[PDB]
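Saturday, quiet lab. Running sequence design on the structure tokens for the scaffold JK sent over.
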């Protein structure tokens, strides 16, 4: 045969199943071959010939199975391998697709992406097995999937990290998994997998030790995995096996009551001097029953907050778990200098031999901090490199608790402490627990990074790659994963199963769910429902550009599935603007909650029509953002929810309100208070802004969607205008449970991301006083009033979309509406069906997001009464000053919220029937 002669570039050939290669470079070329070398690079010798073995490819047509699996490759020129190819032999080393002209002169040569053929060859067999260090009756079975590795050894380490054994593992030909079976004496042992494996990024047969991707226990800072039996009673708090979910999640009416408090382990306790010092920033702070923080959460729970959602508490990578390598702001500046060489070489080096703590230094820097001298963030940006603080969207191991939140990060101790926290939240605080999970990316990839785990063990399989270059994509921020590949889908479901069964997690929030296939999220839900039939899944289902590779798990595509998604519709209508706003747009783009139209600031050009459009989105969201809900829009037109525009997209997208998570604040982007501070008119005084915060939250808390909120909205939480505070430390993320202030105006935010906002910040920042104890207590009262109202009646939380459509309506709609007045009715009368609430025949929710008093005549002649919960709050109520006249007319003061009711008599009454449209 013809010798190819006369280098390798890119990686645009795709070996997608046993006998199919997709490659643009082989088109119309007469000689197309797949060369391979076990132990070196497919390269030309001194002669210039390609002497490595090869498999010849013949042009062919893309099969239907291939086009279904990889629609983004379906137009690639297809080539067929001989049916007798030993795929397992080729996959052990480098493969290169080579095209040549009829004489054998090289036309192009490229590397091969093999994830498709790996799935087609091994995935079914490998999916039938279980992975990790698995303690059994007979002892232990280790198993790791590594279908391309040339060798795998199990390295066993002593407690002091001395090698005590290195065991060659046994490869299973059908699955490509490696196993090793031993005695029960290996319980508690540390271990890694010694890999000998070709990595296409380096084109080397690499040799390295890697922790177990199915690790369930770790040494300090995740350097070694550890054999554990999570069922061990020594790893459980007393009574763990009997722990029950305090809030039901079985029916859609159950789910709709979900009211989420999105929290972070350090944000909760890092500043609370009434938490024991040894527990600040730890899981166990939730057991400090006498602390300000825990007492505050207990009162929130009593008032109707039902779920704590935890920011990453799986093993993140971006905090060093070796305490001697970390300095926090409560510690001496001298400690910071000894762990942080960037500080020691900085303009702040003069503080190294001082006797001040870092937070004492930051405090003194506040007075002269400004846009022209952003020195608080200058020092804090250095502190952030070596402190204990990160949101943790940086996955190191998916199925071990984070070590730095434990009092002892070495070994199994963190498992019991994590469970002690979960038990404290459920049994002692009475709230369910949601975990934020981040399967959409890894912290790192490639053969060299300390935190690259999956991509060292099966290179180029667990990460999503560019079709041409083979580079790991970074749409997520970081190292994009590939949940469309079967063995990572399995890893995800197996991981969720441990969190569900062994840690008793009640629901899961999928970070960047839009990068997952719809089919994969649904398959995971099917598998977890077998373990916990009431588990709830939701996530960020924005529109993504992965739609060319598979049907994405988005808001639109999840309609009717029961998987929830955050809604950005009510969020942006009430907050104003969008997450991408910068500069003067942050002030111009007022929301319903900050007086769009009705209380304009000096920069906005918002029209009355535009303000009323935001109210349409807000009403639609209060009714659960349903595609088929019927309302009267700003022009008097009859519209389904899907016909209300949201930046060119159909606004209403859901089938049931339990598919919609409404919110006006979250860990991402500016806090609600900082948004109100950007947007409020200069003449809106401090007490008005507090009511703006409460009016904004009322659209969520009194709405039919699931209610979600940021830890501290009830305390007017500020991040000093920081938009993206993931690494902004204790300083900018502070929540003060002693109620002295809301952390506003503690220095200009990080210049790298908010520098473009310094001008507008300086112009708005000092408009009114910073909240103090009086305002914090009044906001907490407002907040607990809203959650208590939501909790008090099943009419707020109907759950079923058809039931919402049969019962929920709006008044003050159309072209003659009073702008900013949101009036929702919920029917419990005879035309709705059964009475769901024996105390009332109907409810009216009136939110007057306006600086005028408003009078309503819609309920004239009815028996309407102000809710007793709000009457009991007196002049501290959001309904303070509301008047219900004899004739049924109702007057609301400025910036007020009233829940009114028709009292139910001896039999079900007429109620508030939905108007015909
Ligand atoms: O150094 C790694 C990575 O750090 C930074 O990315 C972080 C984001 O800045 C931060 O906002 C957070 O992003 C997550 C959101 O909080 C979450 O709600 C959702 O939208 O997913 C995001 C990604 O998980 O965390 C990331 C990762 O730590 C930085 O911006 C990146 O450039 C950098 O590569
Ligand atoms: O991924 C890294 C990224 O994380 C954070 O950005 C997130 C936004 O904060 C968050 O609002 C969301 O953005 C979506 C909009 O909300 C939605 O209305 C629509 O426009 O889609 C947007 C995403 O396409 O998600 C992003 C992505 O996580 C963080 O703030 C960034 O700094 C960081 O770069
Ligand atoms: Ca940090
Ligand atoms: Ca793409
Ligand atoms: Mg960690
Ligand atoms: Mg009733």
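Result came back. Writing it out in full:
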């Amino acid at each position: 045969d013809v010798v190819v002669r006369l280098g390798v570039a890119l990686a645009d050939a795709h070996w997608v199943d046993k006998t199919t290669l997709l490659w643009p470079g082989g088109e119309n070329k007469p000689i197309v071959r797949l060369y391979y070398s076990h132990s070196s690079k497919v390269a030309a010798d001194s002669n210039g010939e390609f002497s490595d073995k090869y498999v010849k490819l013949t042009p062919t047509t893309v099969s239907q199975q291939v086009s279904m699996r990889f629609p983004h490759l379906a137009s690639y020129p297809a080539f067929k391998l001989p049916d007798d190819v030993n795929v397992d032999e080729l996959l052990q080393g480098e493969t290169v697709a080579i095209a040549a002209e009829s004489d054998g002169i090289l036309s192009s040569a490229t590397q091969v992406q093999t994830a498709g053929v790996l799935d087609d060859t091994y995935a079914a067999a490998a999916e039938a097995l279980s992975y990790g260090a698995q303690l059994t009756d007979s002892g232990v079975t280790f198993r790791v999937w590594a279908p391309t590795a040339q060798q795998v050894e199990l390295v066993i380490y002593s407690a002091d990290k001395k090698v005590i054994a290195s065991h060659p593992m046994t490869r299973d030909s059908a699955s490509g998994a490696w196993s090793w079976q031993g005695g029960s004496d290996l319980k508690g042992a540390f271990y890694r997998y010694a890999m000998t494996v070709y990595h296409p990024q380096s084109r080397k047969v690499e040799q390295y030790e890697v922790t177990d991707p199915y690790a369930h226990s770790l040494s300090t800072n995740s350097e070694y995995s550890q054999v554990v039996d999570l069922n061990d009673s020594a790893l459980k708090p007393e009574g763990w096996d009997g722990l029950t979910m305090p809030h039901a999640q079985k029916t859609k009416a159950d789910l709709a009551k979900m009211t989420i408090h999105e929290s972070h382990i350090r944000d909760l306790s890092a500043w609370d001097q009434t938490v024991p010092a040894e527990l600040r920033g730890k899981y166990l702070a939730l057991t400090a029953q006498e602390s300000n923080m825990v007492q505050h959460l207990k009162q929130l729970s009593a008032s109707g907050v039902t779920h704590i959602e935890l920011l990453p508490v799986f093993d993140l990578a971006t905090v060093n778990e070796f305490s001697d390598k970390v300095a926090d702001i409560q510690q001496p500046f001298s400690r910071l200098c000894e762990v942080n060489s960037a500080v020691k070489s900085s303009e702040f080096a003069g503080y190294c031999d001082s006797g001040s703590t870092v937070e004492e230094v930051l405090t003194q820097l506040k007075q002269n901090d400004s846009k022209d001298n952003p020195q608080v963030q200058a020092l804090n940006t250095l502190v952030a490199q070596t402190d204990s603080y990160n949101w943790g969207y940086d996955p190191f191991h998916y199925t071990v608790p984070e070590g730095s939140y434990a009092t002892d990060p070495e070994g199994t101790a963190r498992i019991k402490e994590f469970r002690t926290m979960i038990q404290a939240i459920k049994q002692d605080l009475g709230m369910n627990v949601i975990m934020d999970v981040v399967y959409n990316h890894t912290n790192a990839a490639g053969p060299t990074d300390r935190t690259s785990v999956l991509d060292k063990i099966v290179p180029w399989y667990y990460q999503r790659l560019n079709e041409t270059t083979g580079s790991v994509e970074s749409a997520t921020c970081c190292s994009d994963s590939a949940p469309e590949h079967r063995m990572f889908a399995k890893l995800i479901a197996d991981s969720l199963a441990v969190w569900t069964t062994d840690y008793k997690i009640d629901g899961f929030r999928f970070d960047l769910m839009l990068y997952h296939p719809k089919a994969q999220i649904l398959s995971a839900w099917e598998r977890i429902k077998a373990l916990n039939p009431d588990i709830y899944f939701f996530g960020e289902g924005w529109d993504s550009n992965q739609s060319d590779r598979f049907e994405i798990a988005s808001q639109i595509n999840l309609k009717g599935t029961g998987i929830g998604t955050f809604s950005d519709r009510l969020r942006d209508a009430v907050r104003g603007g969008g997450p991408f706003d910068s500069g003067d747009a942050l002030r111009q783009n007022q929301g319903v909650g900050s007086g769009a139209g009705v209380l304009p600031n000096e920069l906005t050009t918002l029209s009355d029509d535009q303000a009323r459009h935001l109210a349409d989105l807000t009403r639609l969201g209060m009714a659960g953002n349903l595609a088929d809900f019927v309302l009267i829009d700003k022009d008097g037109a009859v519209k389904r929810g899907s016909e209300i525009d949201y930046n060119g997209a159909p606004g209403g997208y859901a089938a049931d309100p339990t598919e919609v998570v409404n919110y006006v604040s979250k860990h991402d982007n500016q806090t609600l208070w900082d948004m109100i501070s950007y947007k409020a008119a200069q003449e809106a005084d401090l007490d008005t802004r507090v009511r703006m915060q409460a009016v904004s939250l009322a659209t969520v808390m009194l709405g039919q969607g699931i209610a979600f909120d940021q830890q501290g909205s009830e305390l007017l939480r500020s991040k000093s205008f920081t938009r993206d505070s993931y690494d902004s430390g204790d300083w900018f993320n502070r929540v003060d449970y002693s109620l002295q202030d809301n952390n506003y105006n503690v220095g200009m935010p990080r210049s790298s991301d908010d520098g473009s906002n310094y001008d507008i910040i300086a112009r708005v920042k000092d408009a009114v006083a910073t909240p103090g104890e009086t305002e914090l207590k009044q906001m907490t009262a407002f907040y607990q009033e809203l959650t208590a109202l939501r909790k008090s009646s099943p009419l707020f939380t109907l759950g079923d979309g058809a039931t919402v459509m049969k019962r929920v309506d709006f008044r003050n709609t159309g072209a003659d509406q009073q702008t900013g007045l949101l009036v929702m009715t919920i029917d419990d009368g005879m035309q709705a069906g059964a009475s769901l609430d024996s105390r009332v025949d109907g409810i009216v929710v009136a939110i007057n997001a306006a600086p005028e008093s408003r009078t309503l005549q819609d309920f004239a002649g009815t028996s309407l009464q102000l809710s007793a919960i709000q009457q009991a709050a007196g002049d501290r109520s959001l309904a303070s000053g509301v008047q219900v006249a004899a004739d049924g007319s109702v007057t609301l003061p400025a910036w007020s919220v009233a829940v009114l009711e028709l009292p139910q008599g001896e039999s079900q009454g007429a109620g508030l029937p939905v108007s015909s449209k």
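Notes for JK: The first helix runs from residue 64 to 69. The pocket of magnesium ion (ligand 6) is lined by residues 828, 835, 837-838, 840-841, 904 (CB under 6 Å). Ask whether to fix the surface positions before the next round.
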